[PDB]
Amino acid sequence: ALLNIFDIAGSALAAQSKRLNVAASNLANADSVTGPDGQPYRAKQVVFQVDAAPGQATGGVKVASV
Amino acid sequence: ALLNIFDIAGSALAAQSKRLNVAASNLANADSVTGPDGQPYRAKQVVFQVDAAPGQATGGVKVASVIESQAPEKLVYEPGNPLADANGYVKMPNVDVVGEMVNTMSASRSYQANIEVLNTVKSMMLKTLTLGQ
Amino acid sequence: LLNIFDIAGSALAAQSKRLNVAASNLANADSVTGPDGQPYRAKQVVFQVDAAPGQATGGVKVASVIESQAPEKLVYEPGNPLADANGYVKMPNVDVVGEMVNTMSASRSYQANIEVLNTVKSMMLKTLTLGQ
Amino acid sequence: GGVPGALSNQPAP
Amino acid sequence: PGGVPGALSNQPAPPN
Amino acid sequence: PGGVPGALSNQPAPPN
Amino acid sequence: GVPGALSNQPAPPNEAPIATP
Amino acid sequence: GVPGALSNQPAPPNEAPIAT
Amino acid sequence: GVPGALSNQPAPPNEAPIATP
Amino acid sequence: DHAIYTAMGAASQTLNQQAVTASNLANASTPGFRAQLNALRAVPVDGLSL
Amino acid sequence: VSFAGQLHAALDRISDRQAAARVQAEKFTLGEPGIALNDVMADMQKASVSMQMGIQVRNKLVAAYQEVMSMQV
Amino acid sequence: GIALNDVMADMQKASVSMQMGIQVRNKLVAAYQEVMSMQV
Amino acid sequence: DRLDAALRFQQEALNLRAQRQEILAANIANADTPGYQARDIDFASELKKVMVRGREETGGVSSPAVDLLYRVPDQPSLDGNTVDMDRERTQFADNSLKYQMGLTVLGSQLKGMMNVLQG
Amino acid sequence: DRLDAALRFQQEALNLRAQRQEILAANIANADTPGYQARDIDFASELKKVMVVDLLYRVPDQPSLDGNTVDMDRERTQFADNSLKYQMGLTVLGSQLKGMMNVLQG
């Protein structure tokens, strides 16, 4: 589908957007006492992995889970 | 022998595209912490060689192999992250952002120069085909 | 090879050399030592007319690269190994504003020469179709 | 070969 | 003998 | 002939 | 599966309740 | 040699050491 | 000597002395 | 075309110097600490012509 | 083996080159991995040059045939 | 292999030589027919 | 023989122009390769050499029998290549125009001959 | 006609690129509509189908509160890529037509 450079850079943009979203959600919930139910909010982290890819030498960034 | 310019400039274009791709891959993973195998991402770089078989005077350029960049891995003190060291030294890639941006710009400029070479060569081939007519 | 082409190429080379000298000077505004331990003395190119067989008009050639003779700046750091008996370390005499302006003017001259060369090449291309 | 070009289609499809 | 193009071969290398 | 181009020449200097 | 893929099914509605139902 | 001229002998490998 | 014209004689060398003499 | 690499080297080494300075400042409360000095050395490239 | 055979061989070679370039272009447009835009564009360039060469050869050959058929007998 | 520079140059020569042969033969044939169209 | 000899100078000059442009394109392609000395040929001397003695090849991997000389570098570089881009692009444009000039001269001569063989 | 068979593939690719471009721009325009699903087409499968359209929902990346699944970065990259591929298809089709023309000119 995408050209290789397009895919790599777009994946980078999406990963940075996810990291920024996690940071913003953490900064919003800095003073929260209870969450949806009654359990405290836990700070979220985003883990960057390199898309293995067939090439391996060239690959973008994916986010496995928060 | 203007046809060999096609091969020379095409090889140069492919090599510069590969170099730009490798530089962009390094740049996009500057903040990565983990690989598919759990190893930290190692900054990679292409190797340029003269695409000349034994006995060939001058050729284009070819990518011999992709090699891990020689630089100390960036140590970060975060002994709370699930990935860590014995002393909590998270290893992050050794990507030098300024170097990668300059590499991307240089690859783009060399690519465009090779495109100009190809364009003017094709124009000359058409002329030549209009030699006597 | 072709005269105007020779002129424009020589001038492009000269302006590129001046730009490189200015960039190297700007990089070394704060440098304190070199490999031998001597201070970095700012470089400046010398332009000379390349009209050896072309009477008084021709291209421009860079005769030499010379260390500027402006006095070296002195900083009082008596603990520095490079400090002399008086405790003064010599720092380069690079003028930042001058180097920035040199870079800008060299860039403009480079672009002007490129435009000149393009116009001349187009004129010969049209000359190649004389009488037809 | 081992490295796909920047202007190639997603090696990862 | 070629080598690594760009940043690595244009930064001042270690002596040995 | 010619001298240093740019900053050094287009700056006032002591007479000599 | 991967974020940004193509599927033949619309995503479920994005509800965020304030209290547990 | 004049820069831009042609010579039959190659230029020597150049190096930029940090410490003499 | 109209500016922008052509004259047989070369232009005199300009000088910028910082003090008076 | 190669002045870009000179400027890039200058910018990268400025980043390195800033990293050294930030590491020094982070240890303003470290007991018995010795600050790391920083200096930009100039390396002249030795080719044949200029 | 013969002149007609050589001309047929040249036409087949030119058509095969053009078809190869077209097939690679369609494969790239398809989204299949491994096909680079650089190679597609260069191969299209080469195919265009080969087509122009064939056109020039045909033009001359026709001109020479017309010249011969004008010969007085 | 052989480049367009050589291919085109030899192609043009051959065309030139063939045209020269055609013209010379036409002159010879015209002279012969003028001689034979005589009246004795 | 006569026609071959009359058109031989410009044809050989045009072939040498093609080979020189191949060399210049190789220099432009290797402009970012570390440790590549720029190569170029002396057009006039090699042209006279090819006229007195016919064209020859090293093998036939094949290459011409031209002398690949080294260009004098302008300013030093840490990677170790002497490909200065201004020089490369000026020589490329000059060689381009001179090749077009050779094409024009050869085409004019060939028409100047078809005009005669035209009755 | 044989002329159609030669130019069928590039014409269909160009039309499919234009349709997908319209779909992506519709996704961009309706970014702020709450409850709008980002739709797209699988270019290769539809190109097979036309040579021998159905809209597929985009997999959401981040959960918004208003139900909008349109992501700016992903569709901006896809939009730029589709523009580039449309230009490439125009170039290829024009080259084929120009070759067919210079074959005839004389």
Interface size, chain B vs chain D, as Cβ–Cβ contacts under 8 Å: 21
Indicate the SS3 state at residue B51.
Answer: strand
Nearest-CA distance from G2 to chain N in Å?
Answer: 8
Among J residues 21-50, those touching chain H with beta carbons less than 8 Å apart? 41, 43-50
Nearest-CA distance from M59 to chain C in Å?
Answer: 31
Whether E12 and J9 lie within 8 Å, measured CB to CB:
yes
Report the residue from M42, M70, M78 with minimal CB separation from H11: M70
Closest CA to N91 of K19, K50, K14, K48: K48
DSSP β-bridge partners for residue M64: M57
Q: Which DSSP symbol is given to J46?
A: B
Whether C19 and chain J come into contact, CB under 8 Å, resolves to yes
Whether M107 and B5 lie within 8 Å, measured CB to CB:
no
Task: Quote the distance between the C-alpha of residue K49 and its chain's center.
Answer: 8
Whether A58 and D9 lie within 8 Å, measured CB to CB:
no
Q: Which DSSP symbol is given to M42?
A: -
Residue C61 contacts by C-beta under 8 Å, 6 or more apart in sequence?
A: C10, C14, C47, C48, C49, C50
φ, ψ for residue G7 (rounded to 5)?
-135, 155
Which residue in the block uniquely carries the two structure tokens 């721009």?
N25
Which stretches within M1-119 are classed as H helix?
Answer: 2-6, 8-29, 43-52, 85-114
Whether E11 and chain J come into contact, CB under 8 Å, resolves to yes
Q: What's at C117, amino acid-wise?
A: L
CA R_g for chain F: 8
Instruction: Give the span between the Cα atoms of C67 and F4, in whole angstroms.
Output: 10
Q: Do chains I and L touch (3 or more CB pairs under 8 A)?
A: no
Which residue in the block uniquely carries the two structure tokens 């067939």?
A54
Report the residue from L4, L15, L29 with minimal CB separation from K72: L29
Indicate the SS3 state at residue C90.
Answer: strand
Among B residues 75-104, those touching chain J with beta carbons less than 8 Å apart? 96, 98-99, 102
Task: Please say whether the beta carbons of C82 and C60 come within 8 A.
Answer: no
Task: Quote the distance between the C-alpha of residue N65 and its chain's center.
Answer: 30
Work out the angle at residue N13's Cα, subtended by the Cα atoms of residues N7 and N19, and round it to the nearest 5 degrees.
135
Whether M94 and chain H come into contact, CB under 8 Å, resolves to no
Whether L16 and chain K come into contact, CB under 8 Å, resolves to no
Work out the angle at residue K28's Cα, subtended by the Cα atoms of residues A7 and B11, and round it to the nearest 5 degrees.
85
Interface size, chain B vs chain L, as Cβ–Cβ contacts under 8 Å: 20
Burial class (CB in 10 A: 0-12, 13-18, 19+), J7: middle
Distances (CA, A) of C69 to C43, C117, C130: 10, 36, 55
Whether B102 and E7 lie within 8 Å, measured CB to CB:
yes
Which residues of chain A does K33 touch, with a Cβ-Cβ cutoff of 8 Å?
54
Q: What is the 3-state secondary structure (H, E, C) of chain L?
A: CCCHHHHHHHHHHHHHHHHHHHHHHHHHHHHHHHHHCCCC
| Optimal mutation site among K29, K30, K32, interface D, most CBs of chain D within 10 A | K32
Question: Which chains touch G (3+ CB pairs under 8 A)?
Answer: A, N
Work out the angle at residue B40's Cα, subtended by the Cα atoms of residues B38 and B41, and round it to the nearest 5 degrees.
115
Closest CA to B38 of E10, C19, C114, A52: A52
Task: Quote the distance between the C-alpha of residue C119 and its chain's center.
Answer: 25
Work out the angle at residue N10's Cα, subtended by the Cα atoms of residues N5 and N13, and round it to the nearest 5 degrees.
125
Q: Which DSSP symbol is given to A3?
A: B
| Optimal mutation site among K30, K37, K41, interface D, most CBs of chain D within 10 A | K37
**Cα within 13 Å of Cα(B100), Cβ side:** 19
Whether B69 and chain J come into contact, CB under 8 Å, resolves to no
Task: Give me M38's structure tokens.
Answer: 């720029």
Whether B125 and L4 lie within 8 Å, measured CB to CB:
yes
For every residue of chain N, DSSP letters joined together read -HHHHHHHHHHHHHHHHHHHHHHHHHHHHTTT-TTPPPEE--HHHHHHHHH----EEEPPSS--SSS----HHHHHHHHHHHHHHHHHHHHHHHHHHHHHHHHH--
φ, ψ for residue N54 (rounded to 5)?
-115, 135
Instruction: Supply the angle between the helices B4-28 and M8-29 in degrees, to the nearest 10.
Output: 10
Instruction: Give the span between the Cα atoms of K53 and H8, in whole angstroms.
Output: 39
Report the residue from B6, B129, B130 with minimal CB separation from K46: B6
Nearest-CA distance from M104 to chain E in Å?
Answer: 40
Instruction: Supply the angle between the helices K3-30 and N43-51 in degrees, to the nearest 10.
Output: 130
Residues recorded for chain J: 50
Element (H, E) at A18: helix A4-28
**Cα within 13 Å of Cα(C49), Cβ side:** 10
Nearest-CA distance from J24 to chain C in Å?
Answer: 19
Whether E15 and chain H come into contact, CB under 8 Å, resolves to yes
Whether J17 and chain E come into contact, CB under 8 Å, resolves to no
Closest CA to C127 of B113, N76, M105: M105
Which residues of chain J does H5 touch, with a Cβ-Cβ cutoff of 8 Å?
none
Nearest residue of G to residue N63, measured between CA atoms: G14
Task: Please say whether the beta carbons of C43 and C92 come within 8 A.
Answer: no
Indicate the SS3 state at residue H15.
Answer: strand
Which residues of chain M does L23 touch, with a Cβ-Cβ cutoff of 8 Å?
117, 119
Whether N92 and chain K come into contact, CB under 8 Å, resolves to yes
Structural determination approach: cryo-EM
Q: Which DSSP symbol is given to C75?
A: E
Nearest residue of J to residue C103, measured between CA atoms: J3
Report the residue from G3, G4, G20 with minimal CB separation from A36: G20
Whether I16 and chain F come into contact, CB under 8 Å, resolves to yes
Q: Do chains D and A touch (3 or more CB pairs under 8 A)?
A: yes
CA R_g for chain N: 18
Distances (CA, A) of B54 to A40, B2, B125, M40: 70, 21, 28, 20
Q: What's at B22, amino acid-wise?
A: V
Q: Do chains I and J touch (3 or more CB pairs under 8 A)?
A: no
> Distance between terminal CA atoms of chain M?
23
Nearest residue of J to residue H10, measured between CA atoms: J48
φ, ψ for residue J3 (rounded to 5)?
-70, -25
Nearest residue of B to residue D6, measured between CA atoms: B21
Task: Please say whether the beta carbons of N27 and N59 come within 8 A.
Answer: no
Which residues of chain A does B21 touch, with a Cβ-Cβ cutoff of 8 Å?
4-5, 8, 58
Which residues of chain G does N40 touch, with a Cβ-Cβ cutoff of 8 Å?
6
DSSP β-bridge partners for residue B91: B75
Which stretches within chain B are classed as H helix?
Answer: 4-28, 97-129
Whether K31 and A1 lie within 8 Å, measured CB to CB:
yes
Instruction: Give the span between the Cα atoms of M70 and H11, in whole angstroms.
Output: 8
Burial class (CB in 10 A: 0-12, 13-18, 19+), B8: buried
Task: Please say whether the beta carbons of B82 and B8 come within 8 A.
Answer: no
Closest CA to A7 of M69, C9, N81: N81
Interface size, chain C vs chain J, as Cβ–Cβ contacts under 8 Å: 44
Task: Give me N41's structure tokens.
Answer: 């087409």
Buried b (16+ CB within 10 A) or exposed e, K15-38: eebbeebbebbbebbebebebbbb
Report the residue from B21, B31, B83 with minimal CB separation from A58: B21
Q: Sign of dihedral through CA atoms K54, K55, K59, K62?
A: positive
Whether J45 and M77 lie within 8 Å, measured CB to CB:
yes
Report the residue from E2, E3, E7 with minimal CB separation from B103: E7
Task: Please say whether the beta carbons of M26 and B8 come within 8 A.
Answer: yes
Question: Which chains touch H (3+ CB pairs under 8 A)?
Answer: C, E, J, M
Nearest residue of N to residue K22, measured between CA atoms: N92
Nearest-CA distance from B50 to chain D in Å?
Answer: 17
